[PDB]
Amino acid sequence: HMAGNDSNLIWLDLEMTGLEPVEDVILEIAIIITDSELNILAQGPIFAISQTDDVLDNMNPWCIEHHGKSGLTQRCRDSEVSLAHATKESLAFVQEWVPQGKSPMCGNSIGQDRRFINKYMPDFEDHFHYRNLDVSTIKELAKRWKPEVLESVVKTGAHLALDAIKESIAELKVYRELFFKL
Amino acid sequence: GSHMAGNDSNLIWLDLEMTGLEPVEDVILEIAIIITDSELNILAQGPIFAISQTDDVLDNMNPWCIEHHGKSGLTQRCRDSEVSLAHATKESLAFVQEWVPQGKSPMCGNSIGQDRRFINKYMPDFEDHFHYRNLDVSTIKELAKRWKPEVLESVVKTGAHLALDAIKESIAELKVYRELFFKL
Ligand SMILES: Cc1cn([C@H]2C[C@H](O)[C@@H](COP(=O)(O)Oc3ccc([N+](=O)[O-])cc3)O2)c(=O)[nH]c1=O
Ligand SMILES: Cc1cn([C@H]2C[C@H](O)[C@@H](COP(=O)(O)Oc3ccc([N+](=O)[O-])cc3)O2)c(=O)[nH]c1=O
Ligand SMILES: Cc1cn([C@H]2C[C@H](O)[C@@H](COP(=O)(O)Oc3ccc([N+](=O)[O-])cc3)O2)c(=O)[nH]c1=O
Ligand SMILES: Cc1cn([C@H]2C[C@H](O)[C@@H](COP(=O)(O)Oc3ccc([N+](=O)[O-])cc3)O2)c(=O)[nH]c1=O
């Protein structure tokens, strides 16, 4: 394939037990590679990470109500997948598709996700350039500079990690068309 | 121009110097803050602090750091300082509270997520004034690299030294993108 292109992009999204990685942990991870024009080249290996029920039945109330209602809390018990499992097979996918230190990490408020990857999945982190490509930076500029662009952005729920990433890419495509001057 | 003070669309820009890349071990050496309106006009420049650190600290930071902070006399300003981080945090919080409502402004700058790591560990009271989002000018840099690299000729790079001048640099970079890369 024309994979390994220097300008290819790694997008990802995590679900977690909450906002503070000091104590909280990673529940689900997904990965999409695009070319630089945002064409999805590959959906990588999705993972629920297995944790116990003392972990799962002691989140914040935002997390019990929404990981329950999406069937993720239940998928975590089902899984017998480790973090070092997810890590090795995430970094694997990503070595095929793009080089090393080339792509930033891409998604909405991707810095928050990066806090968890840094602590818990360092080997995966080291493949990335140190920069983020945070689509919410663009959303914050559009709010102030051209707010009506946001009518064309699509918000369809929350869902799995996978469809969240696709919402992020799609959000950026809208910007590419209506907000950037290429 | 206190006219614009309190406007919900104001942006908080900052830059930090640290003793390295890893907040687990490293500490903050300097903080500078600039407030702009949503159209990037500078409304107010914040008190600049070199944070007091002992000689133990200054003399054993990584070699990049003794090199460049040595180079710039930040190291020296840090030895001269009696300014505690608590103090800087208190001053900085009061300053931003004057210019923008709580929860409104993302944190703004180049690779600003990195700074927010140290802000979050060491100055959580100041972090609470910000919206949870970042406005990261280097995101736009990475888009420009791929979609319209020629805009980057118009971005002005220049020297570190001041944390204030690193910030004015980011603002200026975004002004450039505003003009050449965004439709608006
Ligand atoms: C919003 C939110 C998120 N989280 C954690 C748990 C999640 O695994 C993770 C992010 O999930 P997300 O689905 O991206 O969170 C959001 C869901 C909806 C919206 N929104 O469009 O109103 C924004 C963020 O961060 C929390 O712990 N509490 C919260 O209030
Ligand atoms: C409410 C809240 C949320 N978060 C993180 C966890 C969420 O995953 C993230 C939400 O990011 P965003 O910039 O508000 O919003 C989006 C997420 C996804 C999409 N999308 O187009 O798939 C759009 C916006 O924000 C925080 O880090 N702190 C918070 O207080
Ligand atoms: C680049 C770099 C940074 N750091 C730590 C100490 C610094 O105080 C802190 C902040 O980085 P910075 O002082 O703002 O340095 C740079 C700013 C912009 C650019 N640039 O030209 O893209 C390079 C460095 O990060 C290091 O410890 N080593 C480094 O090589
Ligand atoms: C090499 C390296 C650098 N950094 C930090 C050091 C700096 O604090 C920060 C600089 O990020 P950037 O995206 O390269 O920053 C810029 C700052 C100002 C301007 N400008 O011309 O206005 C451009 C880029 O990135 C890291 O966080 N990790 C690293 O491994």
Numbering used by the authors:
A (entry chain B): 0 to 181
B (entry chain A): -2 to 181
Task: Please give sentences taken from the publication describing this entry.
Therefore, oligoribonucleases (ORN), RNases targeted toward short oligonucleotides, are needed for the complete digestion of short oligonucleotides into mononucleotides. Among these, ORN belongs to the DEDD superfamily, comprising 3′-5′ exonucleases that require a divalent cation for activity. Structural analysis results show that CpsORN is a stable dimer and its active site is formed by swapping residues from the other subunit.
The putative active site of CpsORN was confirmed by solving the structure of the pNP-TMP-bound CpsORN (D163A inactive mutant). The pNP-TMP complexed D163A mutant CpsORN crystal contains two pNP-TMP molecules in the active site of each monomer, but no metal ion was found at the expected position of the magnesium ion. This is consistent with the fact that the D163A mutant has no RNase activity, and bound pNP-TMP is not cleaved in pNP-TMP complexed CpsORN structure. Structural alignment between the unliganded form and the pNP-TMP-bound D163A mutant structure of CpsORN has 0.503 Å overall r.m.s deviation for 159 Cα atoms. The major structural differences were found in the α2 helix and the α8-α9 loop region near the active site, suggesting that ligand-binding induces these conformational changes. This change leads to the shift of the α2 helix toward the active site. The α8-α9 loop region also shifts slightly toward the active site and interacts with the bound pNP-TMP.
